[model samples]
Target: NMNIEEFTSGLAEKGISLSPRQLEQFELYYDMLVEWNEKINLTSITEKKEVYLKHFYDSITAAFYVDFNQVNTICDVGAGAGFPSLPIKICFPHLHVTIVDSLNKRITFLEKLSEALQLENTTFCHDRAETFGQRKDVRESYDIVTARAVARLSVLSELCLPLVKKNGLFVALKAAAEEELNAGKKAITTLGGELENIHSFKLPIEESDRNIMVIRKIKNTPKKYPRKPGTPNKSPIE
Candidate 1:
């Protein structure tokens, strides 16, 4: 077992401050995550230490990609294991968070995790990104739409752009795959997003190479796009 206090306080070293109660909740959720992961594969980072570094801390670093002071509502599209989203929820409790994944099982885990962790301001949705993007409750509702290693930037725009309100920012947390990031460009423009910046960094704890491809949703996305389950990724925007 990891030391909940030390590990949580370590976040302060990385610039994320969690109260003692928050740290305990985080640790408790870590235990529940490992337990639930056995019945079904939710994440590959099985060890607690690895989970903290690779999953928890890795996800929350999205705060560094933008001006957190202005962000309020955010949707983490394809939030498998509640990455970036869950960690973001924990770090920014005031911000209303929505985590969406197509898989019912993952959504189940998210619901359980939220209830167990008492993550009050966050909700998990069992819907495909495209469909959620079009719904009024979700479509154009987020100040920032964040995703981590979810899909190629090209396909990612189609999957995530529709969820961003006009003038909102879309952030794609990615790996070092140059071609994939490059390929995302055409799709970005087609989906009403302009690729603004690609901030590259290594995860401080593990030094893993990662990049945040920042895209701004420039205008209203067409209503007909994001057709269905197979369309966004299969045909993509580009």
Candidate 2:
């Protein structure tokens, strides 16, 4: 079962101490996820224990390597069901979060969930990544940008790199994607990002392989980049 002990124990290894408030937030989040998921296709992993381990625990796994305390703002591209970012927000609470997903239903669900959780400084955008990345108010505005299992590193860089401020980082969560990283190197450089680090780890009980790619934004992305709605996935950066 999705025991709270298992969640706490996994976090303990990363030196993350969850206060009562934080723990309550996580439980509430699970309830909300299951409740809304029944109406909309929020998630496939609905089992209590699986949700906690795969959705909740795996989401925050990025925190093990990234310093959330130092990050001020985070933009998660195509964050359906709010993996990585929302959990990070609940855990840290101080960091401002912006989540953009093309699906309007998911956007509404996130809004309701965030309101229920009383989470502040979060924006749930119902727009495509291609357009969201062009917004003047959001472009190059965040200290960190995250995309988890959204797209290939090459295509994802186009969708996410524009929102990362110079010197900020774009973090991608993946599984057994070593070749994807190598394939994405040119795209990373073209998007003004440098492959700063790659943190590899396994999930506690399942022992599933996970890779966290940290790409530092070395310069600003040009205005003409990001192309359009479907072009990145179609052509990629290669």
Which candidate leads the pack in TM-score? 2
| TM value for model 1 | 0.91
Please provide, for model 2 over 150-192, each residue's C-alpha lDDT reduced to its tens digit, 9 standing for 90 to 100: 5888999999999999999999988865577777998899989
Off by over 4 Å in 1: 1-10
How high is each candidate's TM-score?
0.91, 0.96
For model 1, state the Cα shift of residue 75 in Å: 0.9
Candidate 1 lDDT over residue span 47-124, tens digit each: 887777777777776776676668888888865688887777777787888988988988898888888888787878
Please give the lDDT score at residue 35 for candidate 1.
89
Model 1 clash pairs are 154-184
